[PDB]
Subunit: 125 residues, 4 copies
């Protein structure tokens, strides 16, 4: 991982570890913008489709007029570490920030940043 990738992991980790343990708010995300800012958020769990942390990040970035996001990561509570984006988040990320990379674990459990398109092969169009 690059310096900025490690930094996103640290920011997301600090975010989730800094709030009370909760079944409603259990994952944090951090993303980097092309204009030199970092946005965080936590999920809102709900059966009607409450947003993942990544989507909260996207809305937070949009509220700040941070156009292009270039890298994103999700970190689970209780020291779970890096979580790969769920399929819903992958679709929203592909559609709204097609240039973005997401930090996921490789087969060795080692963090790596992968282009969003690679996380949705034979993508829906």
């Amino acid at each position: 991982l690059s310096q900025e990738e490690s930094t996103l992991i640290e920011r997301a980790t600090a975010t989730i570890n800094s709030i009370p343990i909760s079944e409603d708010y259990s994952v944090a995300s951090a993303a980097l913008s092309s204009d030199g800012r970092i946005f965080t958020g936590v999920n809102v769990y709900h059966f009607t489709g409450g947003p993942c942390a990544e989507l909260v990040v996207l809305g937070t970035a949009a509220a700040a007029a941070a156009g292009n996001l270039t890298c994103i990561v999700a970190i689970g509570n209780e020291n779970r570490g890096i979580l790969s984006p769920c399929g819903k988040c992958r679709q929203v990320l592909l559609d709204l920030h097609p240039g973005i990379k997401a930090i996921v674990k490789d087969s060795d459990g080692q963090p790596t940043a992968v282009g969003i398109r690679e996380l949705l092969p034979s993508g829906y169009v």
Copy 2:
């Protein structure tokens, strides 16, 4: 009429949606008040898979800050649409996660008014 703090929510959400490019994806801003005095903002993320409304982005932003219970929320539309009542999905999430919250809606006169979330979902479904 509205309390001072309630008016501040309308101001803040109006500033937010007037501070971002006009967009079909990012078209509504929201602001909520915590019992701790802080205000949290958010903009929606439109998507057919169920991208969050602005209110849900606010909820996640407040949660990220370990906010004290939220007491009031408002949504403000782009293109100068003004106050928008929360959609049914947002109403359900607010009822379930912040049952004490009020939402700012327009009365009969088009005048801002704070209403308990329960009033916005009569015979409310209870997520157990």
Copy 3:
């Protein structure tokens, strides 16, 4: 009191959920009535990404049958939970796609009653 058709909806949704294995993923059934008199049923698909409630599965089932306008809907929970009021998300989709629809809910005395969808979303969201 409910019409014959409305009672039939309750019976059909109840039969549907009672007929399947108890499950955390599939835990509510719904039945709706179309203006032409047909009945469509469905069960929910629970998922954190926003899997559909039974009502929405019923909407897609009716749509697959070119059912047109739906006039009444009800949801019934598993394990003899009985009538459940539609959640806020279902209310919004129902109002938007079938504005003429009523939902069966329990009134303040616990008695089934058919209510216009608009009444279930006061000061509703309009674009």
Copy 4:
């Protein structure tokens, strides 16, 4: 594809072509259960997360106590043909029917059945 798989495409195509053209009801899906039954459905578009056709199929199959679904396909209206499942559907399919395959188009535009895990690499 196998003949059972080809039938899914036929059934989903018939379903979407049988209904009035609509912006709300625009995709049909068909799935095969382990015992050979076929279940169909159409989407319900809504900004709050109305279900894709696949999820309607999942609830339809569940209503019939179908158990495991082994194959699924989505067909777009207006002769759009096979549509790869979106990321949301991929996630639900993975979680509720991990043994399932989805029919997608290959490089030559020809139908191919792919395991759901391959459609969500490094899957959550």
